[PDB]
Design a protein around this nucleic acid. Structure first.
Ligand SMILES: [Mg+2]
Ligand SMILES: [Zn+2]
Ligand SMILES: [Zn+2]
Lengths: 99, 906, 241, 75
RNA sequence: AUCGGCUCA
DNA sequence: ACGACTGAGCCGATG
């Protein structure tokens, strides 16, 4: 099995197993342990954004490896935007403070 | 506020006007969709006039299309024409005609209402569930406050004095109760109250009330919002409305709850200002508020609802917990792209850094690497035109692939990742098939084996990702282990037997009395076919030692070694003495070469040298014509005697059973020691009647030579075959236990060269079907143990430049009466000192120089004793054992610590 | 037990039949008797004259009718308990008790784990001290040991609030010192989320994104390894201002 | 640098600032051309950043002092 | 997508 | 009184 691009499940903007392609491989927390142990700062940044979630930056990074730039340019994954919207509607105030 | 560079987060309660702000329009009607055509109804749970349209910059009705009208506030369909993704963020609400007791502030013990009002939990239900009243204000009816009264009586309270006396009913009672209970009041009534009648564990709740009140108004909350005055609703995209395959509708439990709730809130509104029969009503403030203590959190009161199959309905609550929410969906349950999967295979031609990637795989990964370095080279005019040349399987495609894989490494993963070596980087090259290939040494570093296994295969993108995958994660840093001071990547299994077969000593083979003119003449005298790998002979060697500074030292000498031994001296990288290889090298003493090669020289030639052993290991492994014959399953000569003399030693104690020199109960164990005596009476007529078995002599006639037996050699080399296994195979199987533990009357006599008795199999059944049923929860419990342990010591990092005090903890060698394992040289290693240098490292080269003084009494500045803000000071710790140097400001101490208990937790 | 031996040790719960370490040093003698007991007396000469304790009913003792007992003696046999030695001696042999039980399990199987690895966690266990005197907030309570030095090294000098706060010692093994993360982010990834996210609401708790688990979730860079020197430049601008 | 980077690690000092001294240098030689100094042995901009450390060159002291040079040439 | 079923590391 | 492994495969069935 393999993966590099395709489609994503509506809610959690992440891959789904079925037609077009198989299941895209999973990245666990016991797996992240290894990334936490090595100096895997930049790698762990791409994982959670430009490989799975990020709606405006995962695909807007796409043409920086094509264009021959090789760069990040991330922002914010939606799984949090879910978690935020769940807590506001669970019954709480919670938000982002700035500089 | 505009720029989104977030720095900090705060949490707080849910005010009415606040939740209203997040909301854009009330979820007034409780509708989903018009079962005719799939359009989210007018005022329903789904609707664009609230949440935005069902497409990009479009509407429902159909005047405004494509893009133009950016934020055109329409009406006939009702859409502020924005991109629909608003349906992932915008909210609505449901204004309750009856206040609804929120649950998370109530039935989460010990009640955030209970010790905020000085009260239990059973109580608050009674008035809110609907049986009794409660008092509020201090006036004139002699009922004070927070009193409890079941309906009947209340008649004589507003029929005695009256006027100044408040007492309503419902959740509503708890609402208006929290309104007027002044908090400049309640607070300063317990700081001169803990003065004498304190007690020692009656004051365990009196200190649970001082915290909760003090931290409340100073944050800017105030407790009115405890009970929900108004209900928030989710965005439409998140709760997914999706009609799957067969004209059929797919939605999770969210919706089934949100509805009914409103079906009562509309029965409610049409029966608040439409005649209020207040006993026909208690049917409503009940059932409505009984469904929000089901929405928010289903399973709390008492397994209230079910689906359509007698199994519980999931809730807003269990969208975080249940190991499967949006908390274990940001780390654990996290799918990743630019990767693949396949089964693992050997690769005995590879040099360490080299993986064997399935060409197929590489290609379907590196697609957006190739597209762009094709357009740049001038072979394509668009991305899509290249989308045909790729799929066509055009030749030039694979050309670019070879120069892309050139200088672009890979991540290679095996689950379970118990520690950190479970992932490493290996610079791949191309090799076609469906299968992935790998090294057989890192076999041990990974939790790995070639038998039915699988590896996922990521790709690090950014320049950084690549280089830090090379700098750290790469296999080349990981020869030494994190947990301890031993290299994990060692000559496993086969590579071993080659060297034993090679180096193994002798006195007669093919000719002798030779000399050779260097290491080169040796190789001639083998592969041609003029000698064997044996024959003890004096050999010319040009060993280069290291000078004090280095390195004008070129020694010459002529020493005794065998044909075998000396061949490998070729691959021993110049800078090394000789006495290391001078012997019959088992994996044990082969791992020496590495460890000695690592610290005398460095990292850059240990990798080359060692990988080049591996080849040279397998080389003579195969050549040997080695095998597993039923001949070399030799039985001890007089086995049928040792069982037989001890079998009639059973028939002598049973002449004494019912009588009396030994009693009836203790029988079970008197012979068990003489049974267990024979256990290893025979294992030493086996490692003595197969240990040095030769006796066919070329040189005149003599006896002593190491065995020609294939199996034993594995137990002498350290290939595979423990000194307990060997027994069971062609010796004695011996003693087994019960499901309980008590050993059987007759342990096994036979083995696997000869045939077993049915009983004898049928018994062992237990022994191994217990010891493997353990493994059903062995990989389960270690993972529960590891995680738990990591989560306490993970929020932690390296910090200061130095922590400075003369302090620590004792180290004085272990002596359990008379038995030692690790004394001074390999325990106190690496410990940072504080007396005399003081405050310098005790290297691998140092407790040699602190063994020669007859060294005693030690105290060392370590991790517990760390006068260091939040972290580990580094200069008061030890060493990063995943390296041959001092610890560095960065490597997070905590993760590693718990990690190193999972690894050997297996 | 067998395998969860390892678990129990870091877990912190008292075992089966512990001992009785003579808590204070002095002229330690017994007094009175019922069935097979003797009420102990330990009165220090200094200020704290009061002190009395008793024992269960099958312990045989190694201090008879007045011998030189110090801060306890190896009195009655069995596997000792965790909590008291931490209260009594200090934090010097209490850690070596955590090591000289766990290890031999591996030394029969055949594994080494250079001992200082147990400390990293044991420090993350031994933390969460309890302070003696009334200083800035309450007698007992839960506050970090090195926070009590944001207190003890802090209070005894500047300002005008003179009340020193010398420390005392508790053990909270994994599932107990784990609970007390004042950082709702990492807190809710391994405990019952309910009990924190509600006490999150009450007091107005924050999480200023210092952690490792913490930084990860939000889609940010870790403060460790290569991401160390990055989070040296962003956390330093909270004070430069 | 394909086999083992042990020489270029201890030059700058550690393995973490072999990243942000080489990431910054792997960035500079990928965008606006920039000079290839030690023979571009086919290779790519990945190795090059590190390869300049293996022959007595690129360091953090040479990337924050020479960025002032491209702020003295555009006036 | 929740649950149920069953294999291999 | 509480606490429940780490990967992905294949099939099945109803909000
Ligand atoms: Mg296997
Ligand atoms: Zn319209
Ligand atoms: Zn220290």
């Amino acid at each position: 099995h393999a993966r590099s691009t395709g489609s994503y499940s509506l809610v959690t903007q992440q891959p789904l197993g079925g037609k077009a392609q198989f299941g895209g491989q999973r990245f666990g927390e016991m797996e992240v342990w290894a990334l936490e142990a090595y100096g895997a700062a930049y790698t762990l940044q791409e994982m959670l954004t430009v490989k799975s979630d990020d709606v405006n930056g995962r695909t807007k990074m796409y043409k920086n490896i094509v264009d021959g730039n090789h760069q990040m340019e991330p922002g914010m994954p939606e799984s949090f935007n879910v978690l935020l919207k769940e807590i506001r509607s669970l019954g709480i105030n919670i938000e982002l403070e700035d500089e | 506020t505009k720029t989104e560079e977030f720095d900090a987060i705060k949490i707080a309660l849910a005010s009415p006007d606040m939740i209203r702000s997040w909301s854009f329009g009330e979820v007034k009607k409780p509708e989903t969709i018009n079962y005719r055509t799939f359009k989210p109804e007018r005022d329903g749970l789904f609707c664009a006039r609230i949440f935005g349209p069902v497409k990009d910059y479009e509407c429902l009705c159909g005047k405004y299309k494509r893009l133009k009208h950016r934020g055109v506030i329409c009406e006939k369909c009702g859409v502020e024409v924005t991109q629909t993704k608003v349906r992932r963020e915008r909210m609505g609400h449901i204004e309750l005609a009856s206040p609804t007791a929120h649950i998370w502030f109530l039935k989460s013990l010990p009640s955030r209402i209970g010790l905020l009002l000085d009260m239990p939990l059973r109580d608050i239900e009674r008035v809110l569930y609907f049986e009794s009243y409660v008092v509020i204000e201090g006036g004139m009816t002699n009922l004070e406050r927070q009193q409890i009264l079941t309906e009947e009586q209340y008649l004589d309270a507003l029929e005695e004095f009256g006027d100044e006396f408040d007492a309503k009913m419902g959740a509503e009672a708890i609402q208006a109760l929290l309104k007027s209970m002044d908090l400049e009041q309640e607070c300063e009534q317990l700081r001169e109250e803990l003065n004498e009648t304190n007690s020692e564990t009656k004051r365990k709740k009196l200190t649970k009330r001082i915290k909760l009140l003090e931290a409340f108004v100073q944050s800017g909350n105030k407790p009115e919002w405890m009970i929900l005055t108004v209900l928030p609703v989710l965005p439409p995209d998140l709760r997914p409305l999706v009609p799957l395959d067969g004209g059929r509708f797919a939605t999770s439990d969210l919706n089934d709850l949100y509805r009914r709730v409103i079906n009562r809130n509309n029965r409610l509104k049409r029966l608040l200002d439409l005649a209020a029969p207040d006993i026909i009503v208690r049917n409503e403030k009940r059932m409505l508020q009984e469904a929000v203590d089901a929405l928010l959190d289903n399973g709390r009161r008492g397994r209230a609802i079910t689906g359509s199959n007698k199994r519980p309905l999931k809730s807003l609550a269990d969208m975080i917990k249940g190991k499967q929410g949006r908390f274990r969906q940001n780390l654990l349950g996290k799918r990743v792209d630019y990767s693949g999967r396949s089964v693992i295979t050997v690769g005995p031609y590879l040099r360490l850094h080299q993986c064997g990637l399935p060409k197929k795989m590489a290609l379907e990964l590196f697609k957006p690497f190739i597209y762009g370095k094709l357009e740049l080279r001038g072979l394509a005019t668009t991305i899509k035109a290249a989308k045909k040349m790729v799929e066509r399987e055009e030749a030039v495609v694979w050309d670019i692939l070879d120069e892309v894989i050139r200088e672009h490494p890979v991540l290679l993963n095996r689950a379970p990742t118990l520690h950190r070596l479970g992932i490493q980087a290996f610079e791949p090259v191309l090799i076609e098939g469906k299968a992935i290939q790998l090294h057989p040494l890192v076999c041990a570093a990974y939790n790995a084996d070639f038998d039915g296994d699988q590896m996922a295969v990521h790709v690090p993108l950014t320049l950084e990702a690549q280089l830090e995958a090379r700098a750290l994660m790469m296999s080349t840093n990981n020869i030494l282990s994190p947990a301890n001071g031993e290299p994990i990547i060692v000559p496993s299994q086969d590579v071993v037997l080659g060297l034993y077969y090679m180096t193994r000593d002798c006195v007669n083979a093919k000719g002798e009395g030779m000399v050779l003119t260097g290491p080169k003449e040796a190789e001639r005298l083998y592969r041609s076919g003029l000698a064997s790998l044996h024959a003890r002979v004096k050999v010319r060697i040009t060993e280069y030692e290291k000078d004090a500074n280095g390195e004008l030292v070129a020694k010459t000498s002529l020493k005794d070694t065998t044909v075998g031994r000396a061949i490998l001296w070729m691959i021993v990288p110049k800078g090394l003495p000789y006495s290391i290889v001078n012997q019959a090298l088992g994996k044990k003493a082969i791992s020496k070469m590495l460890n000695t090669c690592y610290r005398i020289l460095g990292l850059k030639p240990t990798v080359i040298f060692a990988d080049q052993i591996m080849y040279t290991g397998f080389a003579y492994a195969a050549r040997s014509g080695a095998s597993v014959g039923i001949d070399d399953m030799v039985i001890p000569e007089k086995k049928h005697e040792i069982i037989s003399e001890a079998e009639a030693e059973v028939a002598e104690i049973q002449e004494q059973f019912q009588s009396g020199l030994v009693t009836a109960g203790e029988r079970y164990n008197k012979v068990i020691d003489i049974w267990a005596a024979a256990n290893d009476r025979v294992s030493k007529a086996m490692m003595d009647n197969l240990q040095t078995e030769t006796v066919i002599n070329r040189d005149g006639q003599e006896e002593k030579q190491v065995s020609f037996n294939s199996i034993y050699m594995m137990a002498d080399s350290g290939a595979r075959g423990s000194a307990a296994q060997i027994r069971q195979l062609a010796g004695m199987r011996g003693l087994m236990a019960k499901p309980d533990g008590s050993i059987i009357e007759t342990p096994i006599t036979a083995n696997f060269r000869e045939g077993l008795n049915v009983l004898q199999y049928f018994i062992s059944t237990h022994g191994a079907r217990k010891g493997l049923a353990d493994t059903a929860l062995k990989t389960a419990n270690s993972g529960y143990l590891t995680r738990r342990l990591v989560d306490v010591a993970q929020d932690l990092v390296v910090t200061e430049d130095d922590c400075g005090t003369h302090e620590g903890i004792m180290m004085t060698p272990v002596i359990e009466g008379g038995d030692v394992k690790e004394p001074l040289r390999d325990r106190v290693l690496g410990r940072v000192t504080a007396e005399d240098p003081r405050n310098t490292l005790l290297h691998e080269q140092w407790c040699d120089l602190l063994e020669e003084n007859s060294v005693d009494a030690v105290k060392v500045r370590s991790v517990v004793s760390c006068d260091t803000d939040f972290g580990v000071c580094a200069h008061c710790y030890g060493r990063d054992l995943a390296r041959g140097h001092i610890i560095n400001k960065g490597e997070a101490i905590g993760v590693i610590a718990a990690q190193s208990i999972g690894e050997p937790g297996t | 037990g067998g395998l969860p031996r390892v678990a129990d040790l870091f877990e912190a719960r008292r075992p089966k039949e512990p001992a009785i370490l003579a808590e204070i040093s002095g002229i330690v003698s017994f007094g009175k008797e019922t069935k097979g007991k003797r009420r102990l007396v330990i009165t220090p000469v200094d200020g704290s004259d009061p002190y009395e304790e008793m024992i269960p009913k099958w312990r045989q003792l190694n201090v008879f009718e007045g011998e030189r007992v110090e801060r306890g003696d190896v009195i009655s046999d069995g596997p000792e308990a965790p909590h008291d030695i931490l209260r009594l001696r200090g934090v010097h042999a209490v850690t070596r008790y955590i090591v000289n039980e766990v290890q031999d399990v591996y030394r029969l199987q055949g594994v080494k784990i250079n001992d200082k690895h147990i400390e990293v966690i044991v420090r993350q266990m031994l933390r969460k001290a309890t302070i003696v005197n009334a200083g800035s907030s309450d007698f007992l309570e839960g506050e970090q040991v090195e926070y009590s030095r944001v207190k003890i090294a802090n209070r005894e000098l500047e300002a005008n609030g003179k009340v020193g706060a010398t420390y005392s010692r508790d053990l909270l093994g994994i599932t107990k010192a784990s609970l007390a993360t004042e950082s709702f982010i990492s807190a809710a990834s391994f405990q019952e989320t309910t009990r924190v996210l509600t006490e999150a609401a009450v007091a107005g708790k924050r999480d200023e994104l210092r952690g490792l688990k913490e930084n990860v979730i939000v889609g940010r860079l870790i403060p460790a390894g290569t991401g160390y020197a990055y989070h040296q430049d962003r956390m330093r601008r909270r004070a430069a201002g | 640098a394909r086999v083992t980077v042990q020489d270029a690690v201890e030059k700058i000092g550690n393995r973490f600032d072999l990243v942000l001294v080489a990431a910054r240098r792997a960035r500079q030689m990928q965008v606006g051309g920039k000079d290839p100094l030690v023979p571009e042995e086919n290779d790519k901009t990945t190795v090059i950043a590190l390869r300049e450390i293996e022959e007595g060159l690129i360091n953090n002291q040479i990337l924050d002092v020479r960025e002032r040079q491209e702020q003295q040439e555009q006036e």
